[PDB]
Amino acid sequence: RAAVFDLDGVLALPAVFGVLGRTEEALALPRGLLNDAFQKGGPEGATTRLMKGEITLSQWIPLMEENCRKCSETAKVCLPKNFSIKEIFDKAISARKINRPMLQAALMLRKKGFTTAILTNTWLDDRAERDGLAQLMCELKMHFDFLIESCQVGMVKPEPQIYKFLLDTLKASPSEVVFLDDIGANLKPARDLGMVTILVQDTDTALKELEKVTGIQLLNTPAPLPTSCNPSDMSHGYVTVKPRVRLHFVELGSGPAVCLCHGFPESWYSWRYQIPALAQAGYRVLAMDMKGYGESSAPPEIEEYCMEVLCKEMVTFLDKLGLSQAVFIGHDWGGMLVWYMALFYPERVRAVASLNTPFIPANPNMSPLESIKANPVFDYQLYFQEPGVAEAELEQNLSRTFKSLFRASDESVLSMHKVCEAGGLFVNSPEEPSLSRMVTEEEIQFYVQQFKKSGFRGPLNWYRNMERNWKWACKSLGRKILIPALMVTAEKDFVLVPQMSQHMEDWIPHLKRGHIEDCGHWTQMDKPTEVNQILIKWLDSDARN
Amino acid sequence: RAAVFDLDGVLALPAVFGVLGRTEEALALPRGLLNDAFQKGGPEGATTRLMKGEITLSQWIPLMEENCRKCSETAKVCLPKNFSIKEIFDKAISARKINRPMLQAALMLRKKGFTTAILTNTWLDDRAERDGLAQLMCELKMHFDFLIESCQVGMVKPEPQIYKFLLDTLKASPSEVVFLDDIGANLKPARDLGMVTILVQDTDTALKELEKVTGIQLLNTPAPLPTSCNPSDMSHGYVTVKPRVRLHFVELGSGPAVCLCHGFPESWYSWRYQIPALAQAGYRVLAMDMKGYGESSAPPEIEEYCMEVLCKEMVTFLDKLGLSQAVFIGHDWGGMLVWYMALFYPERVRAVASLNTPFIPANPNMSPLESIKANPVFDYQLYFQEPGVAEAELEQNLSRTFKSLFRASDESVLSMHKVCEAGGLFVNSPEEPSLSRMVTEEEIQFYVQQFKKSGFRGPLNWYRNMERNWKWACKSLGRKILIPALMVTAEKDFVLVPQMSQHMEDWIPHLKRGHIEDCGHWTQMDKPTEVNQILIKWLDSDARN
Ligand SMILES: CS(=O)(=O)c1ccc([C@@H](CCNC(=O)c2ccc(C#N)cc2)c2ccc(F)cc2)cc1
Ligand SMILES: CS(=O)(=O)c1ccc([C@@H](CCNC(=O)c2ccc(C#N)cc2)c2ccc(F)cc2)cc1
User: Fold this and answer.
1) Bridge partner list, A329
2) Which of B167, B185, B215 is the last residue of a domain?
3) In what residue span(s) does the AB hydrolase-1 domain sit (chains A, B)?
4) Which of B165, B188, B215 is at the close of a domain?
5) Is the peptide bond between A256 and the residue preceding it cis, with omega within 30 degrees of 0?
6) Which of A155, A525, B152, B327 has the smallest CB count inside 10 Å?
7) Same domain, yes or no, for B82 and B141?
8) H or E segment at A258?
9) CATH code, domain with A125
10) Rounded Cα–Cα distance for residues A383 and A378 (Å)
């Protein structure tokens, strides 16, 4: 089945066309005058030339002016002193926003296997403010299989040929397609060809008709998840920071650079729900494969994964990309890394935020090993110390590893206490775990394929530098973090517990906080919507300025 | 040999330290008061803690205030009502600019085989305006082999240990190193260790001493070329636009996106002289391998290289990167592509500029083949038509191909007239051309290695769509280009001659122009300095806003 949506008055409101009407009233012009001038000449008039791509919007403005003068002349009325078609359309175009419920329905239909398309009468926009529209189309168009624009195909609704062209690109028969439009005249040829047609006035009634005919719930459905990433559709970047070390990243959006740093044992892909949201919010997102992971290099030496070297390489990464600063947002081990970036390279850090991981200053009077002992839930970290032991258990069955790890707070385990005595992470774990509700089998297989390259040696080495990190961290014991900073705690992270962050204000006076209840350790995919809301509010506040 | 430069008062002026003096005068304070408060406590004072990285600049401010109060108390003077150390240093830091002649000397020394370094007493900067400094250090640091900062190594000049640390990272003996500094006290330990030392007051005298001791001309040398790109040091991006098509690009900088499009038969690397300049000027540069080239995909089908498909893929490229617009700058075939982007996708084009290639509207009354015949210098294009003929000649000896093509206007040939009758491009060409003054043997071998992947089939296919491009271009004959536009002509391009652009104002009313005399077809490497000046002035005018 197929579903086809118009843009103006359907996926975007208010219909620019509906501004003519409101404008007429405001200026106290005769009803319909502006709409009349707009369509004047029908098939051979200025506006049809515009919609077929014969001329640009800026060439059209003067033509529209002329039609307005002729219409006012005929109607025996005068147009206002500073009457300006340029200004009127600027405002109408800018006012138009995405109709979220209609978009949501479109996403549901595609998710359930429909091929979807936007078919729109539109123009080539060369106005100085054309970027606003450019941004609208971009956001919408990514959610659809096809976008057919009159000005690119040289055809316009309601000409019968464009409907045949639609069916051809849909590779579907008319009876297999639903077509939604707010303009009855433009529906007729669709109906004539035999497709199901919906006349959109109010969105809710339209979606009622739409769910009735497709047999799929579209109205009053549960809150959808944020948009995710298809790895194959992303821009992949590669930067050599040292002769044998290259960092891979995925990049999306424009605006202030935002560098996302994942935890153990994860991937750039762990940010899949924030990447599109942050980009759409006006940021240039750079989601790293951290050293040891995925398409980034994974040298064997333990020392290659100490915080001092990892931080230095992140600075080099910025240097090579030509960035003086980025905002750094980290989760888990990535969260610890970003605190040290703030502490040692404040000049390069526009702002810093950590999910789950608190900033804990080094204790100069206690070995890090001792500190780890003094906390039952930290037992698995000692298990990780001896090279080879954990690698073997984690690498044995990768699908099992990730299905056991990536689980919501209710779906547990694992129980990271008494792991050493038990003799392993999964010693009490099923061979074939159920799939957690947070992930799909396909998402799990992505992580599986990523870890086939380098395995767990690199990732585990992040844990094998306790003494070295402690020494380096001690150098910072006189400092405070005084750049913009955000700490997000997760109620149900049973290792990185919210109370671990209780004293951070001592080191970070102006610290801002967020808190997510009913949220386990895997914050980004556990509660993506709330994560996105927290980060975006904080970015627009403390980074973007 | 090695050369080591201080930052403040050497590679950057004025020395922030020299603001204390000017500030004292402006406020009519006792001479030296501010400088005294700044150094108070010597080895154990607040400022030494700052320079060793014990505390940040923002923690230091209050300490400096206190020292100022104590000094004024002792001197029996009062400090002004709104005396503010924060404000004073903000201004001093911002005023500091790169000392271009000193940098130039450093570049020459490195070019001639010196290992170079910056050794600086500096601080961890967590001020709200820290990015200004971040940007200074970034620009400087890329030109040096090492940067040693006191606050990162926990040592400060003039402590003897930092000089030993310098020598260790230089891997050189004292007698092999020259050390330039504006502070005599900081030179002594260097001199004591036996290195050559230069006390920098005025830059010119310092460079006089420097050239005398190195035996290399540093003063009043010819204008250097702009900074180039080392392919291994760049960020490389990859985007799949279609199942079998991926576009590779190099990316540098932040700010408005600027997409550079090369010509035939070139590479992203053809922009090597503009990439660093444009980034430094405040743009995010994306230099493409165009379809058919380098690390981009090279499908065999001729139709894959028509303008309609190439343009559509560039739009998809923007879509996947999350960019609503980019400025498009093209040269040669890239220049033609960018004109069509402006014409068919104005919404996505922030601004458009072409080097050499004029915009020539399609002639609806003449086949493109006919038009090509009507111009002797276009003869080589007919030679290119039949698949396989030109590929064989261009692929036979790649080094020869590029050494013959990439030549300044005086160093010619080739003579692209009567190529068909002659039976080939190089039929009158030497087997082993001399190396043009525009390129090095190493640059030539880069192009050689790039074309080993896909050869010339893809690139030649750009020429094999004359009829198809003409048909598509005819659809635009009613339009004008009304977005910001720049045409740069080159006096000595004997194919894309400046007079070919004479009527462009008819189609592009607000067209801006640049013109480069004594410039051949290979504009970017022929006259990189002037290209950079023209583009940057136009960007800051018509794109950046
Ligand atoms: C029981 S639960 O709440 O669901 C939960 C589940 C999984 C984990 C993570 C934790 C990984 N992170 C760190 O070990 C870490 C340590 C120090 C700093 C510092 N500084 C940062 C991260 C984990 C644990 C064991 C694994 F084999 C894989 C992943 C945490 C809580
Ligand atoms: C004699 S000189 O002045 O030094 C000179 C040297 C080399 C060239 C370039 C020209 C390539 N470009 C185009 O053929 C082109 C055509 C139409 C549009 C359009 N629209 C764009 C480019 C060239 C020519 C032959 C080659 F084998 C390789 C490269 C031009 C002038």
Assistant:
1) A260, A353
2) B215
3) 256-528
4) B215
5) no
6) B152
7) no
8) strand A257-261
9) 3.40.50.1000
10) 10
* A342 domain-assigned: yes
User: Is the residue at A496 inside a domain?
Assistant: yes
Q: Where are the beta strands (DSSP E) in A420-460?
A: none
Give burial (CB, 10 Å; 0-12/13-18/19+) of B242: middle
**Dihedral, B373, B375, B377, B379 alpha carbons, nearest 10:** 0
Considering the domain architecture, whether residues B297 and B429 belong to the same structural domain is answered as yes
Q: Which resolution in angstroms does this entry have?
A: 2.0
Residue B314 Cα distances to A283, B295, B326, B457, angstroms: 21, 16, 10, 20
- Atom number of ligand 1 nearest to Cα A493: 3
Two tokens, residue B214 = 């190195």
Tell me whether residue B121 is annotated as binding: yes
A228 is a domain residue: no
CB A116 within 8 A of CB A106: yes
Tell me the CA distances in angstroms from A6 to A200, B27, B33, one per residue in order. 10, 68, 73
Phi and psi for A288 in degrees, rounded to 5?
Answer: -80, 145
Contact status, residue A348 vs residue A372, Cβ threshold 8 Å: no
B332, HSE (Cβ side, Cα atoms, 13 Å): 21
Residues 6+ positions from B2 with CB-CB distance below 8 Å: B114, B115, B116, B117, B170, B172, B176, B177, B178
Q: Quote the ligand 2 centre to B495 CA distance (angstroms).
A: 6
A121 marked as binding residue: yes
> Is the N-terminal amide bond of A361 cis, ω within 30° of 0?
no
The answer to whether the beta carbons of residues A459 and B38 sit under 8 Å apart is no
Q: Would A474 be classed as within a structural domain? A: yes
User: What CATH number does residue A396 fall under?
Assistant: 3.40.50.1820
Q: Are A476 and B154 in contact (CB under 8 A)?
A: no
Query: Please, which residues bridge with residue A515 across strands?
Result: A489
Do B193 and B264 sit in the same domain of this protein?
no
In the PDB record, what is the listed experimental method?
Answer: X-ray
Does A245 reach chain B within 8 Å, measured CB to CB? no
CATH number, position A85? 1.10.150.240
C-alpha B364 – ligand 2 centre gap (Å) = 24
A353: Cα within 13 Å, side-chain hemisphere: 25
Question: Do B295 and B347 fall within a single domain?
Answer: yes
Collapsed DSSP state (helix, strand, coil) of residue B197: strand
Interface list for B 161-200 with A (CB within 8 A): none
B89 with B110, same domain: the answer is: no
Domain co-membership, A77 together with A132: no
Q: 3-state class of A197 per DSSP?
A: strand
Ligand 1 mean position, distance from CA A351 (Å): 24
Distance from the first to the final alpha carbon of chain A: 46
Best CA proximity match to A254, nearest among B329, B134, B326: B326
Q: Residue B3: helix, strand or coil by DSSP? A: strand
* 3-state secondary structure (DSSP) of residue B341: helix
Look at chain B and report how many structural domains it folds into. 3
Phi-psi map region of B195: left, alpha, beta (phi>0 left; psi -120 to 50 alpha): beta
Query: Does A57 share its domain with A143?
Result: no
Are B46 and B67 in contact by the 8 Å Cβ rule? The answer is yes
Q: From the centroid of its chain, how far is CA B242?
A: 31
Among B residues 114-153, those touching chain A with beta carbons less than 8 Å apart: 124-126, 130-131, 133-135, 137-138, 141-142, 152
Question: Cβ of B500: how many Cβ atoms within 10 Å?
Answer: 17
Question: Domain of A68?
Answer: 15-94
For ligand 1, say whether the CB of A401 is within 6 Å of any of its atoms: no
Co-location of B90 and B100 in the same domain? no
Q: How far is A283 from chain B (nearest CA, A)?
A: 10
Whether residue B357 has its Cβ less than 6 Å from ligand 2: yes
Q: DSSP code of B45?
A: S
